[PDB]
Design a protein around this ligand. Structure first.
Ligand SMILES: Nc1ncnc2c1ncn2[C@@H]1O[C@H](COP(=O)(O)OP(=O)(O)O)[C@@H](O)[C@H]1O
Ligand SMILES: Nc1ncnc2c1ncn2[C@@H]1O[C@H](COP(=O)(O)OP(=O)(O)O)[C@@H](O)[C@H]1O
Ligand SMILES: [Mg+2]
Ligand SMILES: [Mg+2]
Ligand SMILES: [Zn+2]
Ligand SMILES: [Zn+2]
Lengths: 49, 638, 614, 267
DNA sequence: AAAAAAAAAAAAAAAAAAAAAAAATTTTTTTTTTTTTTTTTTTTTTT
């Protein structure tokens, strides 16, 4: 945890980051609802099987 | 076959509630009448007032505004069922019917800056300015194929999975038969729907001054594709959703959000206008057919005292003349141009703002605030297709409207010359090598100029006091020199009027409070009595709304000059050209050409329209003659 | 869902047993004769008239309109099957493709084995052996649509649209059926092309190569392959049919075969054709689904209005001694007076006669300098509408690259092509330059060069060329050596108040405002169509100056030059102007020899134009 | 959705011809009376005499014999339409009306020995003795599920892909809702079909002396499951087809064959 | 008629031929968008 002073020289538009996702299989259509995404700049590797 | 749904309690309840809401015979009948109207007009979208839905059923309103997709599906199923009940033959023509919304959205009425994640899957109403408007592409929803080898015909159905998970099998376009025979797609039998994507930006005036704009992407499906163009102010109501990405074993949390518009409406709700009102207008026209024009003129700008002839001319402008499109394609303009050249503080700017507030399609331009390409059309390159595109300017937008040019005198000679074609023939001819275009701008110009030296020096001729050339002045059909007369009696009149207007207070709404410095309440620009009550503090007067409606109805009428008025106007024009028409010590404020005869004809036609005459009679001709006589001459003192 | 074999038989019946009296009441079997010519290879394109089809089978026309591409193919196959039974003699092998077709048919007959069943992939593609094209002339019942109104509901439909051509590419070779030759089997592979692109084949499918299990690589050939002339134009909405506050919309028309080289930029064209999509593969689409671009596959392009492409009484009116005055009067009748300026504009329309003994232009340049509100812009606009090839420039809206050319990124391939501005589009036509005196100095220099050299020498950074702008100039301005030295005629129009003249003008204008037409006169003014026809008939009537006129013309020139010298500008350009104006008058009179009356009218026009300056 | 045929000329012609044959009213109503009799008896399998079918339309007879599945489906559609026309409520009661064949099969009449791969996808009438039988098992043709969490009721359908390409999607039994809500199957509401497998061996008194006997596997379904027991000299009229193998990746090219019985007869 | 021997059968155990099941992220590409630079065009200032 860090506390720093600065000045904001830009601010991107507000976009939608998923906190939960529901992934459905193409073959059997079964779902894997409510997969907890990590917070911040980070991605998720979908299950392969 | 797969997992079909046998019975669904929530869907059944929703469809029953929506069908009940749509069936209105024990109730007033608004929506039964609306469905009948759309049947008659051959449409497949119904605009349902969220206020009415909330009034008849609060639960359905909350459900529709908080979970829109399936709720709108149920509503559209109910709509199709109701349309089938009214008439099944028409219901069979269209595969589906759509439910657009309107009315007031409490917290769902947001700007592109305020349209955040919290409104995902909800119905939202966003008002903004269009920036980008892609091409209308056809999107295939049902493709017909033919196999020449086996003579078979096939139909492939593609579901609208814009925001739902889509698998490749859904989107596989077939090309070969089961045994690899070639398939030919039959375009005449396949089904395509128009699709477009636009961008809505936070309105520049409503957005915070400091920060950069915020925009939202809007998908318009069939029936909503060419409703908006870049630069327009529009209200889009629809579902704010998330767009699926593409197949991939890795993903960032980021999602691309859009708005699937269910209805789009113009900000120019004032650009468009009951039997009670129609009969009221008829009786108003019939009763006092002679002084109606004068009454309208006096009531035009109630907050400005005097300026009787100026207000008459402004009324003539708002009415406009009658264009003459000849058998050979020749064009004679019908609009009317007024130049208020005046001393400081004589209410010319206030007249401009009045016309801005009143007239439909009124564009405010300033001297140096709208230069060249910003004032007329322009040509640019897409920068993506490397192709040239037109961009409408102030006057192209104001086509069939009015342009209020404040501080017209202080426009560059370049811009003033560029405006000549718009003034005369009402069009902008612009070309770059790639693209040449002839845009229509049949606008009427209302200019507010101050004379050279600041204040009109009455010792010098009007030609000298007006720092404009005769070629430019001839463009303005009416030219009014508005002096700040130093008469103590008129000063008393003006001071009394001003102080009364400053003392006026709103009826009941206000009791001593301060005017406030918007999303909380419905946006007025998009919101859905012959005489005023004779308040003594305002009068010591036709109603604004009735004046608007009457002017709208009288604009369409097309009076035709009668031989008597033609002879009178011709004789008066000959005299006006003659030298005797101006005595000694009187100077012409603008040279008299055939443009002034056209001015006379247009003013007489405007008067006849004010009276709904259907014929421009000697009364109208004499009024136009008198106004021209007042406007085109000035008495210079020594 | 219909039996396409039955539809093919129906179209065959129509083609074989349809007839009309197009030739002086002589039943000639129009489409039978066209089929004869197609078989003889004396005709490439066949235009089927859906009006003719509906004359007997309206429901077939409805089916065609609902699904044109399918029925286009059906008609093409019907014609293909019909050609052999109409063939009467041997084709002369017009071209290399004809040689290839005859070779392929000969060797197929040689290796026929008629009873043997051949694999479907073992035959010549139909498009590979056509040498003809079939297009539809839209039915008269179908009202023309509007580019904006032609939407997804019209996909695959035979729509007819009207508009202005804002751009057209140059005829390029587009491959219809790629051909390949193998390095092992000596058999030809074919690949018909339907997509905008394609992947060239690598391995050969020939029966011999498959049997031998050889590598069988094959090479793409531009020789045996089939191409078709390909043009891509952009048509634009007419001004009169655009929404109130909207800019006109443009549609991409694709022209192929005999329809190319018909429409050039600026033309008013009515295009009948099929509205079709183009799949948008590649782009990472925002919205899932088979979204596709759109275009108009052209079938019948016609020129409209000024772009358009006689009876004994018509010849009588031409021969009438007053024909010149009639033509001068019929120009912009709603504008009162200005009879002499109307005559001058008629002469500008007709032109002189170009001579290349050092090439001296035969164009006539006229500059109407005048006081405000004297019909200058009205006459400019009337000429713009009248002249078959014309452009109009008002002020600085179309300035710089709007008058000259510019380099623009092409689309069919992607590169720097040259797009012509107003002057280029007016080439061999007329350019109406309103508000001349206010134009920029660079544009004025360009007009100066155009008025004498008929060229535009651009040497900017991205461009270095010399455009051809052989356009007459009709300029307008308000109040000069810089213009009087150059312009052929400089006409001053001052509106001096006068009771009688103003009264007559007011009566004329009031009658115009009343009845949306000019007041009746002794003779009915001629329509724009008839005027354009007569102007064009005059253009190709080059007369010559006899040796007799030399002395008279020289005397007139020296006299007028003495007048100019004495008074407080005459040059060789004055005599050139007299010559070309006299030649234009002779053209109007339909004689091959310039006469004393021609020179007299030329000098009278010059004298009155100069008198206007005083 | 997916591909849906609109103009199948062959299917339309087959349906028209089969309905014309089943009309029979002018042709002394033989099959009209048979349809009425099965309606009264509460049966949903029509036995058609191939000799009468050939006499009426030899083209249809040959097409049916040489193309079993397609023509049988067309015949069943025609039979269902005819049953609806005679009595609609019964047609709605029974989803699919089956057609079995009978009569003189010129060459298609064979034994388990002479039944070779030349008869695949054809109608064969094989004689023999039932060497063994299997228990009658129910295969779910339409399952119904109820979700307590949402009170929803879904119904999944499984097609008869016995001798057709089958994918994991078609043969997955739902056990959760889209939100991972456990389901409960409504056995009473679900639709099952009885299915049995028997083995027909060449009759010993007919087999060549001293050789081992030739067998064939036969599949019986609803209304034919218990038509025979071991030791029954039965005549099975059916369609000879190759049974699909399990999803592999490497195939040896060997395909088990089987006879989908459309009719079973005893002595 | 009863005892012993022979064989005949039934059932259980065992070993291959064919078929069926299980296990499975990382590297490279391209598209968009955004910025920088050049030249032409337009605008403004001074004489
Ligand atoms: N005749 C008048 N009647 C009413 N108000 C007037 C009149 N003349 C001046 N005023 C007041 O003086 C002010 C002048 O402002 P404005 O009209 O914007 O400038 P200008 O009069 O120079 O166009 C206005 O607020 C207006 O209320
Ligand atoms: N001699 C005339 N006869 C008829 N109408 C005229 C005549 N002169 C001018 N007009 C009318 O007056 C208007 C002004 O003419 P216009 O040509 O626009 O002015 P300019 O000459 O400055 O371009 C036009 O609408 C035209 O119809
Ligand atoms: Mg002001
Ligand atoms: Mg002009
Ligand atoms: Zn799965
Ligand atoms: Zn080969």
């Amino acid at each position: 945890l860090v506390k720093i002073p600065g000045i904001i020289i830009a601010a991107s538009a507000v976009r939608a980051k998923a906190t939960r996702i529901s992934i459905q299989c193409r073959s059997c259509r079964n779902t894997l609802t409510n997969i907890a995404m990590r917070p911040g700049l980070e991605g998720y590797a979908l299950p392969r099987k | 076959a797969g997992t079909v749904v046998l019975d669904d309690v929530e869907l059944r309840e929703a469809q029953r509630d929506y069908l009940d809401f749509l069936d209105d015979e024990e109730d007033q009948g608004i929506y039964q009448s609306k469905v009948r109207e759309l049947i008659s007009d051959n449409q497949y979208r119904l605009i349902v007032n969220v206020n009415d839905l909330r009034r008849k059923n609060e639960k359905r309103a909350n459900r529709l505004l908080n979970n829109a997709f399936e709720e709108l599906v149920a509503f559209q199923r109910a709509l199709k069922d109701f349309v089938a009940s009214i008439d099944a033959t028409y219901a069979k023509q269209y595969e589906e019917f759509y439910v657009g919304l309107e009315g007031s959205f409490g917290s769902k009425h947001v700007s592109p800056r305020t349209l955040t994640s919290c409104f995902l899957s909800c119905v939202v109403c966003v008002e903004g300015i269009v920036t980008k408007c892609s091409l209308v592409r056809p999107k295939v929803v049902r493709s017909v194929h033919y196999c020449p080898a086996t003579k078979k015909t096939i139909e492939r159905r593609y579901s609208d999975l814009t925001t739902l998970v889509a698998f490749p099998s859904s989107s596989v376009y077939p090309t070969k038969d089961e045994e690899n025979n070639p398939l030919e797609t039959e375009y005449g039998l396949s089904v395509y729907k128009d699709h477009q994507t636009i961008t809505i930006q936070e309105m520049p005036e409503k957005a915070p001054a400091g920060q950069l704009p915020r925009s939202v992407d809007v998908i318009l499906d069939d029936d909503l594709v060419d409703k908006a163009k870049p630069g327009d102010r529009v209200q889009v109501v629809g579902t704010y959703r998330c767009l699926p990405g593409k197949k991939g074993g890795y993903t960032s949390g980021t999602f691309r959000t859009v708005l699937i518009a269910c209805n789009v409406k113009q900000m120019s709700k004032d650009a468009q206008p009951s039997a009670e009102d129609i009969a009221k207008i008829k009786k108003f026209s019939k009763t006092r057919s002679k002084d109606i024009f004068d009454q309208l003129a006096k009531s035009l700008a109630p907050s400005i005292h005097g300026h009787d002839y100026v207000k008459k001319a402004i009324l003539c402008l708002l009415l406009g003349g009658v264009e003459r499109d000849l058998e050979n394609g020749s064009h004679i303009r019908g609009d009317i141009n007024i130049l208020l050249i005046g001393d400081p503080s004589v209410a010319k700017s206030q007249l401009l703002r009045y016309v801005l507030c009143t007239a439909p399609r009124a564009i405010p331009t300033t001297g140096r605030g709208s230069s060249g390409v910003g004032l007329t059309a322009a040509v640019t390159t897409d920068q993506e297709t490397g192709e040239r595109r037109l961009e409408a300017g102030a006057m192209v937008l104001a086509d069939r409207g009015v342009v209020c040019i404040d501080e017209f005198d202080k426009m560059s000679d370049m811009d003033r010359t560029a405006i000549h074609e718009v003034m005369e023939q009402g069009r902008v001819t612009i070309a770059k090598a790639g693209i040449h275009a002839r845009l229509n701008a049949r606008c009427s110009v209302l200019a507010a100029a101050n004379p050279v030296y600041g204040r009109y020096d009455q010792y010098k001729t009007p030609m000298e006091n007006i720092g404009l050339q005769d070629s430019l002045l001839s463009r303005f059909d009416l030219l009014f020199i508005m002096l700040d007369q130093m008469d103590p009696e008129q000063d008393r009149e003006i001071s009394d009027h001003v102080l009364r207007m400053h003392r006026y207070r709103a009826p009941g709404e206000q009791d001593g409070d301060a005017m406030p410095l918007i999303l909380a309440t419905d946006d007025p620009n998009f919101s859905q009595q012959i005489y005023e009550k004779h308040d003594n503090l305002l009068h010591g007067m036709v109603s604004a709304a009735f004046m608007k409606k009457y002017i709208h109805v009288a604009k369409i009428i097309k009076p035709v000059l009668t031989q008597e008025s033609a002879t009178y106007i011709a004789e008066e024009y000959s005299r006006l050209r003659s030298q005797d028409s101006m005595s000694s010590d009187t100077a012409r404020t603008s040279p008299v050409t055939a443009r002034t005869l056209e001015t006379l004809i247009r003013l007489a036609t405007a008067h006849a329209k004010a009276r709904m005459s259907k014929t421009v009679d000697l009364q109208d001709a004499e009024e136009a003659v008198e106004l021209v006589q007042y406007a085109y001459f000035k008495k210079v003192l020594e | 869902l219909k039996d396409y074999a039955l539809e093919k038989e129906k179209v065959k019946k129509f083609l074989q047993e349809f007839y009309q009296d197009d030739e002086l009441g002589k039943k000639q079997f129009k489409y039978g004769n066209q089929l004869v010519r197609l078989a003889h290879r004396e005709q490439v394109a066949l235009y089927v008239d859906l009006d003719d089809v509906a004359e007997d089978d309206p429901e077939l026309v409805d089916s065609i309109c609902e699904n044109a591409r399918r029925y286009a193919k059906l008609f093409a196959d019907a014609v293909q099957e019909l050609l052999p039974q109409y063939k009467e003699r041997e084709v002369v092998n017009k071209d290399v493709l004809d040689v290839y077709i005859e070779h392929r048919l000969m060797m197929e007959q040689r290796s026929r084995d008629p009873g043997m069943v051949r694999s479907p992939q073992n035959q010549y593609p139909a498009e590979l052996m056509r040498r003809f094209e079939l297009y539809f002339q839209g039915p008269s019942s179908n009202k023309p649509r509007v580019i904006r109104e032609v939407r997804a509901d019209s996909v695959g439909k035979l729509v007819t649209v009207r508009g202005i051509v804002t751009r057209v590419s140059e005829v390029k070779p587009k491959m219809v059926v790629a051909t390949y030759t193998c390095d092992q089997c000596g058999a030809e592979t074919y690949q018909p092309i339907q997509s905008p692109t394609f992947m060239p084949l690598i391995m050969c499918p020939s029966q011999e190569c498959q049997t031998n299990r050889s590598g069988g690589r094959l090479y793409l050939q531009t020789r045996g392959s089939r191409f078709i002339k390909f043009q891509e134009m952009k048509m634009q909405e007419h001004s009169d049919q655009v929404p109130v506050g909207n800019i006109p919309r443009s549609i991409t028309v694709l022209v192929e075969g005999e329809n190319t080289r018909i429409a050039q930029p600026g033309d008013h064209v009515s295009v009948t054709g099929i509205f079709l999509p183009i799949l948008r593969t590649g782009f990472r689409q925002v919205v899932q689904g088979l979204l596709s671009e759109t275009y108009l596959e052209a079938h019948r392009i016609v020129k409209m209005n000024k772009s358009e492409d006689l009876t004994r009484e018509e010849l009588r009116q031409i021969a009438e001694e007053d024909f010149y005055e009639k033509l001068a009067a019929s120009i912009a009748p709603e504008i009162y007076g200005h009879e002499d300026v109307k005559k001058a504009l008629l002469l500008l329309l007709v032109g002189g006669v170009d001579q290349s003994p050092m090439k001296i232009r035969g164009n006539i340049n006229i500059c109407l300098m005048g006081d405000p509100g004297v019909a200058k812009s009205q006459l400019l606009s009337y000429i713009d509408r009248l002249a078959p090839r014309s452009q109009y420039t008002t002020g600085r809206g179309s300035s710089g690259v709007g008058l000259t050319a510019a380099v623009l990124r092409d689309s069919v391939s992607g590169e720097l092509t040259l797009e012509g501005g107003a002057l280029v589009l007016a080439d061999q036509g007329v350019c109406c330059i309103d508000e001349f005196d206010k134009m920029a100095e660079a544009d004025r220099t360009a007009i100066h060069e155009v008025m004498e050299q008929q060229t535009i020498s651009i040497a900017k950074a991205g461009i270095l060329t010399t455009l051809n702008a052989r356009c007459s100039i009709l300029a307008a301005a308000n109040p000069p050596a810089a213009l009087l030295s150059r312009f052929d005629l400089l006409w001053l129009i001052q509106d001096r108040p006068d009771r009688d003249n103003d009264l007559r003008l007011a009566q004329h204008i009031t009658y115009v405002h009343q009845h949306s037409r000019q007041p009746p006169s002794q003779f009915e003014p001629l329509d724009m169509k008839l005027m354009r026809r007569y102007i064009a008939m005059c253009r190709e009537k080059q007369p010559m100056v006899p040796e007799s006129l030399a002395d008279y013309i020289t005397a007139a020139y020296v006299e007028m030059r003495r007048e100019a010298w004495a008074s407080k500008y005459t040059s060789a350009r004055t005599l050139l102007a007299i010559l070309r104006l006299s030649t234009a008058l002779a053209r109007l009179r339909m004689v091959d020899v310039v006469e004393k009356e021609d020179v007299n009218e030329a000098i009278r026009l010059m004298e009155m134009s100069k008198d206007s300056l005083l």
